[PDB]
């Protein structure tokens, strides 16, 4: 997934 | 029925302001027995036929007088202010209203010209693996620039995000460690000057090896705030009047003016330095700068930007390039491995091209450029403002033409190649009356 500042 | 006659010049001064090919007669007996005085002003060739000798035809013409023409540097140690890459440096153009004045502009790319490079890096969590290979960027880039110049200074800065909601979590815990428990992320921060420009590349490596990665929430980061500070904070970064390269290394988009409103930041960027202990302090007070603002402050401070971004965000920063003069875009890898070669390629493209810009001109005054580059390619219109594919030691020329219609007093504007401090001072005087 990895959205925002590298939030998997 | 030319324009000169159909303007009824009441005096000599009026005849000049109306048409460049006009002349005023002052010899009696010229007038036919029933002429109006609105006839002494007429086409220069027409007055000679109607019966008006040259002695009695006043016709002031604009002249061109160079005032400073220091020659371009040649082979037979020199400080960068003794080096000349453009000439002349000052001249006077007397402008007949309607007539254009033209003068040549020589540009020659200096050899072994010094370079200052500042590396501004994204230390957000998404740039974790990247920081691992910059351990040796210092010495390795120092070694590679030896080929380019015998005088190279390097610096390092970092950035993350505005330190306010909603761009970061505001809980006391996440303020201490914005990442998960597994990571040991440092607290979020806007911008810090890790190292000012220097020649000791050994310092570069040790300092970068002491930086901890940080973190925040939204994907796009606040690099523009940092770009602004690096641009305007002149003496704290240590910019010399030479080639100035800003490497902007990120793996995500960018915040810009308008986004501050989410966090209650309505006040626009002021374009002023605000460093306390090499920390940007006013990220919570001033909005992100707009692109147009950065264009202004990057140009006046002669910064040449190299965007070193990942494959994913190439199209975004490619459009940013099109809006920023004297900048380049390269594809950064995952571990920032090809960064050195990325920087060299970017440099060689920026240095092989010169672009001229001029200051504000008064109404009536207009300008146009005619470029003459290597191999006979000749630009005109907007292409006249630039020449590309310029090697070291190569010379190129520009024929600049200035025209005036109105009749203001003594105006003045500068012409300057982008990236360099050297400029050409054009002083204007207006011929409004007869001599």
């Amino acid at each position: 997934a990895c959205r925002g500042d590298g939030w998997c | 029925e030319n324009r000169c006659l159909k303007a009824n010049a009441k005096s000599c001064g009026e005849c000049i302001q109306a048409g460049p090919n006009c002349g005023w007669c002052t010899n009696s007996t010229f007038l036919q027995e029933g002429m109006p005085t609105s006839a002494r002003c007429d086409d220069l060739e027409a007055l000679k036929k109607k019966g008006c000798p040259p002695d009695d035809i006043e016709n002031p013409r604009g002249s061109k007088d160079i005032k400073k023409n220091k020659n371009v540097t040649n082979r037979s140690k020199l400080k960068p202010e003794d080096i000349t890459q453009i000439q002349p440096q000052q001249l006077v153009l007397r402008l007949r209203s309607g007539e254009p004045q033209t003068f040549t502009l020589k540009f020659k790319r200096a050899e072994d010209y010094p370079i200052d490079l500042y590396y501004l890096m994204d230390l957000s969590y998404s740039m974790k693996d990247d920081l691992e290979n910059v351990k040796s960027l210092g010495t390795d880039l120092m070694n590679e620039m030896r080929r380019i110049t015998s005088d190279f200074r390097i610096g390092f800065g970092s950035f993350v995000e505005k330190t306010v909601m909603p761009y970061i979590s505001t809980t006391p815990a996440k303020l201490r460690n914005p990442c998960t428990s597994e990571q040991n992320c440092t607290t979020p921060f806007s911008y810090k000057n890790v190292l000012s420009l220097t020649n000791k590349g050994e310092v570069f490596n040790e300092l970068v090896g002491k930086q901890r990665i940080s973190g925040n929430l939204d994907s796009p980061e606040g690099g523009f705030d940092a770009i602004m500070q690096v641009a305007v904070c002149g003496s704290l970064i240590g910019w010399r009047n030479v080639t100035r390269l800003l490497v902007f290394s990120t793996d995500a988009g960018f915040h810009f003016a308008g986004d501050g409103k989410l966090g209650g930041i309505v006040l626009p960027n002021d374009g002023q330095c605000h460093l306390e202990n090499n920390m940007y302090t006013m990220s919570h007070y001033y909005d992100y700068p707009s692109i147009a603002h950065l264009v202004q402050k990057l140009s006046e401070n002669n910064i040449q930007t190299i965007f070193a971004v990942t494959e994913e965000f190439q199209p975004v920063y490619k459009e940013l390039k099109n809006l920023i003069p004297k900048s380049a875009v390269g594809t950064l890898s995952a571990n920032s491995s090809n960064v050195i070669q990325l920087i060299i390629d970017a440099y060689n493209s920026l240095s092989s091209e010169v672009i001229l810009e001029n200051g504000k001109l008064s109404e009536g005054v207009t300008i146009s450029y005619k470029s003459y580059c290597k191999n006979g390619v000749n630009g005109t219109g907007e292409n006249g403002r630039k020449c590309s594919n310029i090697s070291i030691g190569d010379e190129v020329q520009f024929e600049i033409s200035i025209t005036s219609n109105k009749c203001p007093d003594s105006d003045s504007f500068k012409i300057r190649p982008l990236g360099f401090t050297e400029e050409v001072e054009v002083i204007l005087q207006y011929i409004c009356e007869c001599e």
Partner: protein, 450 residues
């Protein structure tokens, strides 16, 4: 051009309260017209609330003191239900300090909507700092007041509606339906939410923080490629779907690689009808939007502001001036490309940061438009331009130019950052304009004449 620009009435709020950040007409009847003024940095009597923000009611007939604060919420920050006993420590569940209440102000009939886009809470579970935003709805002329925080849901944090900031923009329909913009939902994809005053009331239940209005209309989450779009940054209403139910105009300023776009949603089932794209990167196309018929043909026309639009001067110098785009509606639909464009002349003036319809200012059978450049003028105090509607849309030249009469202090006035027109408060048969200027905590009202 008939606005009494030489003698406007000025209102003054508390210093540093951003009085005039939001403005609005209020009329719970033909008699008793008033001016509403938001001041999102005003201190309040709420216990333990630093600068909660407040909305001011300013009845017409100034003497002695016009403006007074509307008490939407006298209570401070509520406490965590499952932590009053605990071990040691009484935790607040919500945070009303610095919530910017009154950032947005809208009214319809005897109803008033006021929003706090920076209100945040913790949730009754894991400790967070989610700025869900909140709104307070006053109805039947203050006889009852309701909180409405449709982003304060079961879906917390950025991945959900935690950073929605519901109320960042807002508007009433001509029937009184509430429409909210929340640019932070689903990792800043943005969101539009909407419910009737009835639905909000028939489900109101203060005991449980997470309220769920039945029948609420709202855009849904999309794939992550749409993150960071800021849908709901700005909002307007008008009829574009060929019925009698007004539709939702919404700015998406950072959508499509930051070229931005505006979208129009079907007012009945909030589904997409139109899309209009910006022409330059990061011009903030969609910063402000508005809807009104500017050529007297019965069909509402679209207006969009891009205050960071950069352009080139004749001598080859770039400059941030801003620009406004106007799309005219026809029976067949709306053309994807603008019909005309208006461009600012002052560098960094942010032309097009605010827009409002004025109604027919000169009674010439054509509605007119006011456009604000909050940093225009020789002293950068701010400017408002009035453009006249006509047979072929808005005129190229402005009919009037409103500038503040007071001198420039050491901070910007933001004159023209907040506008509101199309209402005749004095009743002279000519519409009136309310210009905000929160920079010096003032709000100006201009008055038309025959």
């Amino acid at each position: 051009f008939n606005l009494d620009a030489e003698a406007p009435a000025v209102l003054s709020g508390p210093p540093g309260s951003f009085f005039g950040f939001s403005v609005e007409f209020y009329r719970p009847g033909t008699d008793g017209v008033s001016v509403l003024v938001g001041a999102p940095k005003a201190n309040t009597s709420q216990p333990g609330v630093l600068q909660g923000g407040a909305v001011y009611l300013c009845p017409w007939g100034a003497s002695p003191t016009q403006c007074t604060p509307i008490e939407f919420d006298s209570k401070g920050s509520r406490l965590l239900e499952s932590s009053l006993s605990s071990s040691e420590g009484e935790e607040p569940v919500e945070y009303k300090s610095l919530q910017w209440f009154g950032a947005t102000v809208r009214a319809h009939g005897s109803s008033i909507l006021a929003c706090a886009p920076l209100y945040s809470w913790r949730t009754e579970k894991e400790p967070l700092s989610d700025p869900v935003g909140t709104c307070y709805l006053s109805t039947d002329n203050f006889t009852r007041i309701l909180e409405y925080a449709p982003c304060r849901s079961d879906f917390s944090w950025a991945a959900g509606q935690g950073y929605c900031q519901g109320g960042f923009s807002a508007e009433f329909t001509k029937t009184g339906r509430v429409v909210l913009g929340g640019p932070g939902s689903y990792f800043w994809q943005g969101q539009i939410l909407s419910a009737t005053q009835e639905q909000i009331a028939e489900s109101y239940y203060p005991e449980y923080l997470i309220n769920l209005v039945q029948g609420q209309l709202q855009t849904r989450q999309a794939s992550s490629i749409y993150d960071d779009s800021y849908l709901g940054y700005s909002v307007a209403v008008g009829e574009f779907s060929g019925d009698d139910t007004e539709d939702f105009v919404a700015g998406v300023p950072k959508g499509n690689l930051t070229y931005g776009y505006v979208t129009i949603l079907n007012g009945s089932d909030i589904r997409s009808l139109y899309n209009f794209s910006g022409e330059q990167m990061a011009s903030y196309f969609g910063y402000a939007v508005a809807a009104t018929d500017v050529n007297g043909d019965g069909l509402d026309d679209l207006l969009v502001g891009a205050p960071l639009l950069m352009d080139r001067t004749p001598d080859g110098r770039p400059q941030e001036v801003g620009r406004v785009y106007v799309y005219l509606q026809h029976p067949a639909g709306i053309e994807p490309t603008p019909t005309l464009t208006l461009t600012g002349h002052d560098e960094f003036g942010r032309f097009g940061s605010s827009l409002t319809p004025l109604g027919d200012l000169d009674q010439d059978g054509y509605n007119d438009v006011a456009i604000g450049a909050p940093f225009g003028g020789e002293t950068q105090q701010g400017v408002v331009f009035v453009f006249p509607g006509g047979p072929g849309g808005l005129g190229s030249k402005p009919s009037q130019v409103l500038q503040p009469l007071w001198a420039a202090s050491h901070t910007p006035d933001f004159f023209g950052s907040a506008l509101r027109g199309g209402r005749d408060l004095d009743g002279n048969g000519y519409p009136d304009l309310i210009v905000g200027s929160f920079g010096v905590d003032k709000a100006v009202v201009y008055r038309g004449r025959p």
